């Protein structure tokens, strides 16, 4: 089928799920706790084993009261509502979701290959064909998400999981939002923020295209285009209107990056009349077979060493904390639809 045929069926499938969301599809007692894979103000991610199947999953655990304090109620309801409705080869799948008196749970597929982040930092940088292979997956993923009126808002190597075939899967929809107009929330990660977000303007899906420019630059250089010790210093560099490229960057790469890391919204690739085709048809992607990437037929440039479905060697060690469940229901109204 054509891109349009695929996207039309994709919207019909998404809308049915968006309008009648899946809710309470599992319970905590159906999982065995293995190890904490990640922890921060946004919550924890726990490796769990589902007893009925023996499958491993990454369980995102959110403390309802902490979500309220962080003013993330609407963002959390967005994340779960969007995740249960989407279906794309390069998105981490939401397998189950449920809540109890104290916490919200999102059970996701577990990719022991880990985040692109760890591999990128250790290796140092990815050669242009290697960075291109990942970038092609993100372009197709944003074409899919944006067609559903979804803005992602947190692209970075930390949110890109590497599967057993070396393909990537976008995870963490904490700031994803279904919006047809412009939006104003100050959110994302400092290095990846478009100038319009820093400048407190109303913004749209073009921020995701800017973030793609940052990602490609970081993948190919080994460091982001705008970095400093503190976020305030990063913002100054982003708004200054200046970017420097490593001497090893190809002429085509630099040209694509000037078009993505473009302050002028009437000129930024992805935003314009021709949309995503301005990116797909760029000289840097001349060797890219978009259909073969989608069909997962392209040989991956890197396959993480496979050490078992429950292996955690690609994740750091975190302090193991209890999963406390109060005897009293917390935040009943705020999360009734979760």
């Amino acid at each position: 089928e054509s891109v349009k045929e695929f996207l039309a069926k994709a919207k019909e499938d998404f809308l049915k799920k968006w309008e009648n969301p899946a809710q309470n599809t599992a319970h905590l007692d159906q999982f065995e706790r293995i190890k904490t894979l990640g922890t921060g103000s946004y919550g924890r991610v726990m490796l769990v084993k589902h007893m009925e199947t023996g499958n491993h999953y990454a369980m995102k655990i959110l403390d309802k009261q902490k979500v309220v304090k962080l003013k993330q109620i609407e963002h959390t309801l967005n994340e779960k509502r969007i995740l249960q409705a989407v279906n794309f080869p390069f998105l981490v799948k939401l397998e189950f979701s449920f809540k109890d008196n104290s916490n919200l749970y999102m059970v996701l597929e577990y990719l022991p290959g880990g985040e692109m982040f760890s591999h990128l930092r250790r290796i140092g940088r990815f050669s242009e064909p290697h960075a291109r292979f990942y970038a092609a997956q993100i372009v197709l993923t944003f074409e899919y998400l944006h067609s559903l009126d979804l803005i992602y808002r947190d692209l970075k190597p930390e949110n890109l999981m590497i599967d057993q075939q070396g393909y990537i899967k976008v995870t963490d929809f904490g700031f994803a939002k279904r919006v047809k107009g412009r939006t104003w929330t100050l959110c994302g990660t400092p290095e990846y923020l478009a100038p319009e977000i820093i400048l407190s303007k109303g913004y749209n899906k073009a921020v995701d295209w800017w973030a793609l420019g940052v990602l490609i630059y970081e993948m190919a250089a080994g460091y982001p285009p705008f970095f400093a010790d503190q976020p305030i210093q990063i913002y100054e560099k982003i708004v200054s209107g200046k970017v420097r490229f490593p001497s090893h960057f190809s002429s085509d790469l630099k040209d694509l990056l000037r078009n993505l890391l473009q302050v002028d919204l009437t000129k930024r690739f992805g935003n314009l009349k021709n949309g995503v085709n301005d990116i797909k048809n760029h000289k840097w992607f001349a060797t890219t077979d978009w259909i073969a990437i989608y069909q997962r037929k392209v040989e991956a440039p890197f396959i993480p060493k496979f050490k078992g479905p429950g292996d955690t060697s690609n994740f750091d060690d975190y302090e193991e904390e209890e999963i406390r469940v109060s005897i009293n229901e917390k935040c009943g109204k705020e999360f009734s639809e979760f």
């Binding site: 921060g40 946004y42 970075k156 930390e158 959110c187 994302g188 400092p190 290095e191 460091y223 970095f227």
Partner: peptide
């Protein structure tokens, strides 16, 4: 080098959302 400057910086680990 830009690489040496990045490596000596405090933002080489996983980055938190704002």
């Amino acid at each position: 080098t830009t690489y040496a400057d990045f490596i000596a910086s405090g933002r080489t680990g996983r980055r938190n959302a704002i």
